[PDB]
Design a protein around this nucleic acid. Structure first.
Ligand SMILES: [Zn+2]
Ligand SMILES: [Zn+2]
Ligand SMILES: [Zn+2]
Ligand SMILES: [Zn+2]
Lengths: 49, 46, 269, 533, 48, 98, 539, 116, 67, 97, 98
RNA sequence: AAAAAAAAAA
């Protein structure tokens, strides 16, 4: 990894805004289906995203 | 190779292949024991 | 700066026990003689047990343990047999080990007592100790079961085994112990005050005492040194007790000569 | 009652005759109970009471089962009696007479259990004479080379080689097939390399043709002992038919790792579901060694500090080397005088040839009476003997207390307790080491260890034991947002979704448990932003 | 107990069934495991 | 002194000065330790972890990474004991070696 | 949970010095240390990686520069057995390896300390005996933990902070935590008596166990007719450097110091060491224990940690080998008093019982004036308890006074090794009064302790006074009373332990970051000032 | 598990010398002899035979650990007589004493058996 | 289960002295006279015979596994 | 088999440890497990009064057999002649009265 | 303590110290007073908490041999410690010594 | 492989 290794200096606590949660989520369109497993492959938008 | 077991109450040399059900064929007792091996193991007397 | 002059007087000798007195020797020599009688005196005992039929009520290692503790007559044999580590053999040469066999099958309704009489030997000189007991036809004691009971069997149980007896000493394992208790005692009258009695009248007198009835301790002699030692060597049946003493002195002499040889070998440096 | 010992005057006839009543714990407030018939015959001038309604049969019946095996419990301190009642259940011996057909998961059976020389009458009814747990041993209470300090004991090595406290540990394993109609199918057969997937590295040659080992086979280490292969699910991929090199998977039963022994018994049967069911019993030999827990019948527990051979052992004028040396410093703070009385009466009963009586509250047994009887057999009246040094041969200046007692081996061997770990399995959640010896888990560096490592002022030992050898991890953190960022290490790209940041990404080493804490707090709608700048 | 098969059997009859004559009993066999019921203390009902 | 045990005066005076530092009675409970001005990770490590953490979330409390338990959570070398300083390589002291 | 650790049962080993621990061979083969590869040890590390994991000593891995791990658990490719400078090889745990040794529960600072590995044959962690006091170990099946540091900076921290001779003095009470215990202390008391004369042969055996001896034999105390040394003359060789100390033995009379024999003791009870050699007195727990100003404290403060740590082990090897000449043993003869003393004790107990019967009679006859501050029951119970406790203490004092010098129970009491006066009193004279919550045995029945007594009986038999000793054996009623008395100690040990641990956790969490800073001030984590100097003097 | 083999108490390993002589540096004419795979037997006899020599000044043995079968003797003599020569003389005198005891015991056994 | 071959502290052979001990016990003797007649003068060997219980006679009552 | 003394779905309200695996290590251990009395007080009480050996346990329960640790005085063992009442109908005593 | 012991009477009439002995004594006193100073960075709060909580495990050895001489309600032992650590606004046994 | 319960050791 060609990233700088730095020690943290402080921990800034806070509340995650819904806009920040929608931005940082890798599930585009949201998690929609409660079925974990779909026919031999994991289902996008499921619980095994 | 059909191997042999000992009935619990008959003490009889039952023999079968390893797919037959566990059952004595003279009295019908469900528990059979495996015979002591023919392989010789060395014991020190200490 | 020279050696002592040990004088020995034997008070009792029988087929399993010797009682004697050492005169004019150091205490280290007598204690080391006791240690080499207990530990480093070699004898023959069974060490290699192989079972082919063990349908009895006891396990394999329990029977091997009980067989291995059986004393064997090894007076004329143990000085000629070598250790297994000192032979060029691999499969248990007759100059390395003694073969024993046992094969008892119980077919009677009564209890079969498998004893040492059923333990046959390939060597005509190595036998269990009950060869001394089977010849007593004057048995007014009332019981002919004078043999070491290996196991008891009921009907349908069998025991077949092949065993090899090796040469070893009691330092390696206690089954090679030739003695059955070496009593060792010096200064029975407490003339040296090596031990301190809070009440000397409360102590029974030793059998080697020299005091009369109203005396309890000898007077204190600060000039006294231990030069009289009472030994009682009792055999377990493997060796005669005089052979125990002779082979113990021979083993001590061999150890000291080996130490001398190793010192003279390292001296050229 | 002597003729019910012949025929028929049972205890029910005795109660029905009207001489014995069952008084419960609520009627005891209204009755007067005599301690003994000696209390009844007192003259009325000095009588404590003249209206007695009941009499105790024997006061020694106030004890239980494990507490009534103690010889002279009225001469000991009460917590020592409680400790012996706790440790009598953990003794070792022949637990049952039909142990050859029983298959328990753990069993301990001594080779030569003996009944005590110093018995109580209450053990006539507990059948302790017929199923004993312990050995009568010659013990000397002295200080020899300092290896018996702090309640430890010194064993005679030659005696142990002669069969002193040698035992057998039986361990049973079991397995069963499953032929349910909707399930995978498994069978008892010897597994094969080309037909079984994920086979563990073990010795499969000891099994028979049915995958079940034979009795008498020596097993050690990680030897496989029951062969069971399960059919793989029908994942018949049509894209590549050559990838199904195995149709079965190994599901065998393996021996426990640090144990050796001989297979004692093998049985096959049918369970309640009718499938094949194998149970095997493997025996191991437990020879006493350094660290095995031994105990008296008076709460004098300890471990074997060292074992000496007979030539290095302290010895009497009769050549009697004792089996066990205990320390005399375990006596005064414990006040187990009943241990010393048991030793004295054991010496008297062994010389005379009688089984001594140690029933509590017996006025017929006294220390002076045992001393007077022991004086007649040519021994010192307090049981002392003059012993000699094993190494040198010199007399011991202080006379020492020797005699036979009854000691019990306990089940807490060191081979069942020793554990070490360098690197092994980790948990699937926190990636920390596992729990227990059986799962090969590490030790718990708890809070108090952290407290006193803070008290030592050692920062690097704390950082090692709490970050370096527990669960190190590296995470990639956005500089602006302080949260966990996407890091693709193959093409060396970094991307924060919440900030659209591609360049300003730092790397932070941290414990894995801290990462689960931060992600769980991110599930708590909390942003623990690690401001690395 | 009364309703078990080992009720009032002799030592030879118990040994022929591979059972210990010194076994006190007092336990159930549930799925092959020996289970014992511990007596539980309680306050005496119908008592003031 | 009721039990005859002796503790040195400094270890007692330190506690007596810790409790009386804030001007009132700061008890050693969850009502005196968690009401201090220390960090969130230090206070949540003792008692009421979720309540302290969510109060610090709602109030945006900044943990300055000065305690020992905070650096233990971070896995860094804690600024305490022997980690209360930094070692720097002297460039001009690198004299003749091998 | 940590990775590199071990845990096993402990057993004593008096032949190990206090900064050593005996490690089994299986634990030593399982645990590894990642030693860096230097040009200094390149041949030894090459033969270590050639030996492999099958033989001890050996290695399990080579950790090279890029993090690649080379297994040696399976003979791997001779081209992979290349040791470059800077590589790490996880060798087996050999001798003189620094480890961290810990017993749980951890109460104080000295409950986990540094030790040096000595690899021993059997399978239990053998430590020294003087380390029993800081670890609170008992050698009765205790399990104990070992941690192996995995870096040389942590190894140096174990060496320079955690090691055992640096942890001798508690900061808790400025006293040593380790003292001479058990038969070592008993034979110290038995050796340093005045009458102990030791021949030339025994001195020459005993000097083999003193490695700090300068190979110069001291001149004997007696030169004619037989050369003899004393016990003090060979204890003087054990004491190193310039150590000067005056204390008193536990049986020193109070009027001897004001008499003319102050500096020449008739009983040899004034312990004095001048210039590092013992001159007067018989040593005991007061001289060689954990007490302040003892010999161990003085030699630590005058000589340093290393010399004191060697002095802890130099006592034990000499003393335990002189104990092979002397010997020590308790028996049933040590618990039996003189018949005249037995008659006096029984007469004193009977007189005390008559006194408490007379107290009961005067209380029933309305003749007992209550003391101010308490009621009539409290006054009566105080008088009864005072009478019975005075009887027990007087009978125990007479029993201890009547014992001879050959008694070994008295020897272990006056040596301080084990026991006290109450043990002698309860074994020889009488057990005494049983107490539940500091009171009489309560009336569990209606006005009766047991159904064999009478209602409203306040005499000492029904109350719970045990008039018999442990040697004589207890009557069944007083056996049950002693059972109730002994249950209370176990109950008090259980209930408390939870809130004591909770109090310890609360105290350690309130003060976990309070540290002496570089300006001398004492501050917490937030930098708030607590003390301008630590302990108000900065020491 | 960790039980050592029972033959290591009397058997040398590969390349293990029995006697390791170490010269002492604190005083003059002193040596420390280390003998492997032996015990208190030989050490007690050799030391108590050495103490009959007037030309020795110090002689003492020690077993450093019961679990290690090894013992040492420190020997310090006068300045005309090597400690190694003293150890030779002690071993030779012990051998002569044991041979004399062996022949006297054989004579006593012979006369006790023939005398009846 | 069965009598040991040798005394533990002592090493004296006691494996031949159990059936004789039982016969002397059942004839008319006490235990002390039986142990004196067997020659076991030391109490280290007398504790090996007084305390021993014969559990192999109970084990022999069970039927063997193989006929 | 489980020891939870009640319904399987509602085992949280049931007492645990009523049925225990029989201890087969020694004969005395089996006899002590078959004669065990358990107090329903939980093993976390700071109150010392239920754990004390009462006067009324004379010859009914064993005074010197309690477990060590937090369960001291709550688990106990019967005396050698302790006979628990089987139970009987109170009718014929009432008609006789 | 220095002035009360190193007075001109004790070092001359009682101790009779020489010159070089006196400078050796002065140098040793100065050196070992330097050595007794507290190290900066030493964790004294946790050391104080452990050195005060360790005697609390030993506060049960004086449980027996108690009868009571005064009928004054006093809380003793670890719960009394609990009353001082927690700052209990209602003590179990409040008492004035007047 | 997880979770729960029980029995224990210091
Ligand atoms: Zn059949
Ligand atoms: Zn050969
Ligand atoms: Zn971001
Ligand atoms: Zn014997």
């Amino acid at each position: 990894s060609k990233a700088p290794l730095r020690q943290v200096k402080r921990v800034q606590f806070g509340i995650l805004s819904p806009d920040e949660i929608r931005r940082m989520s890798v599930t585009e369109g949201g998690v929609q289906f409660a079925e974990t497993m779909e026919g031999g492959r994991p289902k996008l938008g499921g619980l095994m995203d | 190779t059909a191997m042999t077991y000992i009935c619990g109450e008959c003490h009889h040399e039952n023999e079968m292949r390893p797919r037959d059900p566990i059952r004595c064929r003279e009295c019908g007792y469900r528990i059979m024991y495996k015979k002591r091996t023919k392989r010789l193991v060395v014991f020190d007397a200490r | 700066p020279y050696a002592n002059q040990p004088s020995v007087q034997i008070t009792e000798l029988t087929d399993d026990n010797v009682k004697f007195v050492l005169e004019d020797t150091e205490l280290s020599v007598a204690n080391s003689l006791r240690r080499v009688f207990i530990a480093e005196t070699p004898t023959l005992a069974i060490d290699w047990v192989q079972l082919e039929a063990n349908s009895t009520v006891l396990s394999d290692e329990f029977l091997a343990h009980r067989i291995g503790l059986i004393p064997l007559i090894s007076d004329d044999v143990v000085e000629r047999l070598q250790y297994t580590r000192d032979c060029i053999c691999l499969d248990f040469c007759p100059e390395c080990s003694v073969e024993f066999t046992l094969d008892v099958k119980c077919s009677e309704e009564q209890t079969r007592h498998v004893t040492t009489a059923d333990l046959k030997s390939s060597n005509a000189k190595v036998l269990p100790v009950t060869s001394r007991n089977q010849g007593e036809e004057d048995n007014e004691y009332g019981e002919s079961n004078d043999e070491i009971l290996i196991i008891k069997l009921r009907k349908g149980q069998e025991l077949k085994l092949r065993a090899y007896a090796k040469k070893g000493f009691g330092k390696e394992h206690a089954k090679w112990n030739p003695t059955a208790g070496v009593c060792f005692e010096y200064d029975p009258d407490n003339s040296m005050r090596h031990t301190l009695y809070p009440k000397p009248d409360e102590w029974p007198k030793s059998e080697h005492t020299e005091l009369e009835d109203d005396q309890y301790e000898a007077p204190y002699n600060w000039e006294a040194k231990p030069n009289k030692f009472f030994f009682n060597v009792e055999s377990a049946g493997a060796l005669k007790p005089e052979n125990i003493v002779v082979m113990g002195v021979q083993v001590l002499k061999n150890k000291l000569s080996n130490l001398q040889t190793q010192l003279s070998h390292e001296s050229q440096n | 009652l002597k003729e019910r010992d012949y025929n028929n005057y049972s205890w029910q006839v005795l109660v029905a005759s009207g001489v014995v009543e069952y008084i419960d714990t609520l009627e005891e407030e209204t009755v007067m109970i005599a301690m003994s018939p000696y209390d009844l015959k007192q003259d009325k001038d000095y009588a404590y009471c003249t209206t007695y309604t009941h009499c105790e049969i024997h006061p020694a019946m106030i004890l239980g089962v494990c507490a009534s095996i103690i010889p002279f419990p009225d001469h000991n301190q009460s917590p020592r009696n409680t400790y012996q009642s706790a440790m009598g259940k953990q003794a070792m011996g022949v637990y049952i007479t039909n142990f050859h057909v029983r298959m328990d998961t753990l069993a301990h059976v001594l080779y030569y259990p003996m009944k005590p020389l110093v018995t109580t009458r209450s053990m006539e009814y507990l059948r302790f004479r017929e199923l004993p747990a312990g050995i009568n041993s010659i013990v000397a209470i002295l200080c020899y080379t300092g290896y018996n300090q702090e309640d430890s004991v010194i064993l005679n090595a030659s005696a142990v080689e002669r069969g002193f406290f040698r035992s057998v540990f039986y361990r049973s394993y079991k397995d069963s097939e499953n032929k349910r109609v909707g399930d995978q199918e498994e069978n008892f057969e010897k597994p094969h390399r080309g037909t079984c997937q994920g086979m563990r590295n073990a010795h499969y040659d000891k099994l028979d043709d049915d995958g079940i080992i034979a009795p008498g086979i020596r097993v050690s280490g990680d030897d496989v002992v029951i062969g069971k292969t399960i059919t793989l699910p029908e994942n018949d991929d049509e894209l590549d038919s050559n990838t199904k090199r195995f149709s079965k998977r190994d599901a065998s039963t393996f021996l426990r790792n640090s144990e050796t022994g001989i297979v004692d018994q093998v049985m096959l049967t049918l369970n309640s579901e009718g499938y094949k069911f194998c149970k095997i019993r493997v025996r191991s030999v437990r020879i006493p060694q350094i660290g095995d827990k031994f105990a008296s019948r008076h709460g004098q527990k300890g471990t074997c500090g060292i074992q000496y051979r007979q030539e290095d052992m302290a010895f009497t004028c009769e050549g009697l080397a004792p089996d066990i040396i205990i320390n005399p410093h375990a006596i005064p703070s414990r006040m187990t005088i009943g241990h010393l009385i048991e030793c004295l009466q054991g010496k008297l009963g062994s010389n005379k040839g009688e089984i001594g009586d140690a029933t509590p509250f017996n006025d017929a047994v006294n220390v002076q009476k045992i001393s007077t009887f022991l004086q007649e057999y040519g021994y010192h009246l307090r049981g002392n003997e003059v012993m000699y040094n094993g190494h040198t041969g010199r007399k011991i200046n202080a006379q020492v207390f020797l005699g036979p007692t009854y000691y019990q081996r306990l089940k807490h061997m060191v081979d069942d307790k020793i554990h070490s770990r360098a690197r092994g399995p980790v948990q699937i959640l926190v990636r920390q080491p596992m729990e227990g010896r059986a799962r090969d888990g590490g030790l718990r560096f708890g809070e108090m260890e952290r407290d006193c490592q803070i008290s030592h002022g050692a920062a690097q030992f704390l950082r090692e034991r709490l970050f370096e050898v527990s669960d190190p991890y590296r995470v990639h953190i956005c500089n602006f947002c302080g949260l966990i960022a996407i890091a693709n290490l193959r093409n060396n790209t970094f991307e924060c979704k919440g900030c659209k940041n591609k360049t300003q990404i730092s790397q932070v080493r941290l414990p894995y448990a801290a990462k689960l804490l931060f992600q769980e707090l991110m599930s708590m709608n909390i942003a623990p932003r690690l401001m690395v700048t | 107990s009364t309703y078990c098969l080992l009720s009032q059997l002799t030592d030879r009859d118990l040994t022929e069934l591979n059972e210990c004559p010194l076994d006190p009993g007092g336990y159930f066999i549930i799925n092959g495991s020996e289970k014992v019921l511990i007596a539980q203390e309680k306050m005496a009902t119908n008592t003031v | 002194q009721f039990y005859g045990l002796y503790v040195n005066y400094r270890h007692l005076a330190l506690l007596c000065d810790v409790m009386t530092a804030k001007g009132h009675l700061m008890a050693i409970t969850r009502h005196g330790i968690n009401r201090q001005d220390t960090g969130a990770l230090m206070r949540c490590s003792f008692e009421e972890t979720v309540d302290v953490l969510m109060d610090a979330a709602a109030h945006a409390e900044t943990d300055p990474m000065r305690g020992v338990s905070e650096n233990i959570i971070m896995g860094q070398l804690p600024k305490m004991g022997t980690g209360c300083f930094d070692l720097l390589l002297d460039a001009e002291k690198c004299r003749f070696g091998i | 949970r940590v990775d590199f650790s071990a845990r096993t049962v402990i057993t004593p080993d008096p032949n190990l010095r206090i900064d050593q621990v005996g490690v089994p061979r299986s634990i030593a083969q399982n645990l590894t240390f990642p030693e860096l590869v230097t040009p200094f040890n390149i041949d030894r590390m090459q033969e270590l990686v050639r030996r492999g994991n099958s033989q001890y000593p050996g290695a399990k891995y080579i950790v090279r520069d890029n993090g690649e791990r080379i297994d040696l658990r399976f003979h791997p490719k001779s081209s992979d057995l290349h040791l470059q400078c800077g590589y790490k090889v996880e060798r087996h745990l050999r001798d003189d390896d620094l480890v961290i040794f810990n017993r749980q529960p951890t109460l104080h600072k000295m409950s986990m300390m540094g030790h040096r590995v000595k690899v021993l044959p059997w399978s239990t962690f053998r430590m020294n005996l003087s380390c029993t006091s800081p670890y609170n170990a008992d050698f009765d099946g205790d399990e104990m933990n070992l941690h192996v540091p995995q870096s040389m900076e942590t190894r140096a921290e174990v060496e320079n902070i955690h090691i055992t001779p640096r942890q001798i003095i508690t900061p808790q009470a400025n006293k040593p935590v380790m003292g001479i215990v058990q038969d070592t202390l008993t034979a110290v008391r038995k050796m340093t008596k005045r009458d102990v004369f030791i021949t030339r042969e025994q001195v020459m055996n005993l000097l083999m166990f003193l490695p700090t001896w300068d190979a110069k034999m001291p001149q004997p105390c007696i030169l004619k007719p037989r050369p003899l040394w004393t016990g003090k003359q060979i204890f003087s060789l054990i004491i190193p450097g310039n150590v000067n100390m005056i204390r008193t033995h536990s049986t020193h009379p109070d009027e001897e110091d004001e008499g003319p024999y102050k500096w020449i003791s008739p009983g040899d009870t004034k312990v004095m060491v001048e210039h590092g050699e013992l001159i007067m007195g018989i040593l005991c727990k007061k001289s060689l224990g954990t007490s302040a100003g003892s010999l161990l404290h003085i030699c630590f403060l005058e000589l340093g940690h290393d010399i004191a740590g060697r002095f802890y082990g130099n006592i034990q090897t000499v003393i335990n080998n002189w104990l092979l000449f002397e010997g020590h043993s308790i028996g049933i003869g040590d618990t039996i008093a003189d018949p005249q003393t037995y008659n006096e004790i029984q007469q004193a107990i009977k007189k005390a019982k008559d006194d408490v019967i007379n107290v009961i009679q005067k209380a029933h006859n309305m003749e007992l004036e209550p003391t101010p501050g308490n009621t009539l029951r409290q006054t009566f119970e105080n008088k009864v308890n005072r009478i019975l406790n005075d009887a027990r203490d007087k009978t125990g004092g007479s029993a201890k006074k009547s014992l001879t010098e050959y008694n070994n129970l008295k020897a272990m009491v006056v040596s301080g090794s084990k026991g006290s006066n109450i043990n002698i009193s309860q074994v020889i004279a009488c057990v005494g009064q049983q107490n539940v919550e500091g009171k009489r045995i309560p009336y569990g029945f209606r006005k009766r302790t047991l159904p064999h007594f009478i209602k409203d009986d306040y005499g000492p038999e029904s109350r719970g006074f045990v008039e018999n000793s442990y040697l004589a054996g207890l009557t069944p009623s007083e056996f049950y009373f002693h059972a109730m008395g002994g249950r209370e100690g176990l109950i008090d040990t259980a209930v408390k332990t939870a809130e004591t641990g909770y109090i310890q956790r609360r105290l350690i969490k309130a003060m976990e970051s309070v540290m002496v800073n570089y300006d001398g001030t004492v501050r917490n984590s937030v930098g708030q000032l607590i003390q301008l100097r630590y302990g108000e003097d900065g020491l | 598990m960790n039980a050592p083999p029972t033959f290591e108490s009397f058997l040398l390993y590969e390349g293990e010398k029995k006697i390791i002589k170490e010269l002492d540096t604190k005083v003059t004419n002193a040596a420390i002899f280390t003998i492997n795979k032996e015990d208190h037997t030989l050490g007690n006899m050799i030391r108590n035979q050495l103490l009959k020599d007037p030309n020795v000044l110090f002689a003492g043995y020690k077993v450093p650990h019961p679990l290690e079968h090894k013992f040492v003797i420190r020997i310090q003599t006068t300045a005309d007589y090597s400690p190694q020569e003293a150890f030779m003389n002690a071993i030779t005198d012990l051998l002569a004493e044991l041979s004399l005891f062996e022949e006297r015991f054989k004579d006593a056994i012979k006369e006790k058996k023939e005398g009846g | 289960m069965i009598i040991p071959i040798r005394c533990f502290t002592c090493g004296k052979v006691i494996g031949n002295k159990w059936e004789s001990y039982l016969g002397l016990l059942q004839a008319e003797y006490t235990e002390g006279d039986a142990l004196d007649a067997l020659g076991l003068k030391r109490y280290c060997c007398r504790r090996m015979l007084l305390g021993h219980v014969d559990l192999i006679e109970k084990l022999l009552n069970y039927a063997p596994l193989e006929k | 088999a489980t020891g939870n003394w009640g319904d399987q779905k509602k085992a949280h309200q049931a007492r645990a440890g009523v049925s225990q695996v029989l201890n087969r290590l020694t004969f005395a251990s089996t006899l002590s497990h078959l004669r065990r009395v358990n107090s329903p007080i939980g093993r976390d009480g700071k109150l010392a009064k239920p754990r004390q050996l009462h006067n009324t346990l004379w010859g009914m329960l064993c005074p010197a057999e309690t477990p060590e640790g937090a369960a001291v005085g709550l688990v106990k063992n019967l005396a050698l002649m302790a006979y628990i009442s089987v139970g009987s109908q109170p009718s014929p005593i009432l008609e006789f009265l | 303590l220095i002035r009360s012991t190193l007075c001109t009477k004790y070092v001359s009439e009682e101790f009779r110290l020489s010159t070089e002995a006196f400078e050796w004594l002065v140098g040793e006193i100065e050196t070992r007073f330097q050595q007794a100073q507290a190290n900066p960075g030493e964790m004294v709060g946790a050391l104080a908490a452990q050195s005060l909580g360790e005697p609390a495990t030993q506060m049960t050895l004086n449980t027996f041999h108690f009868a009571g001489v005064s009928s004054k309600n006093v809380t003793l032992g670890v719960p009394r410690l609990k009353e001082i650590i927690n700052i209990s606004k209602k003590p179990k046994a409040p008492s004035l010594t007047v």
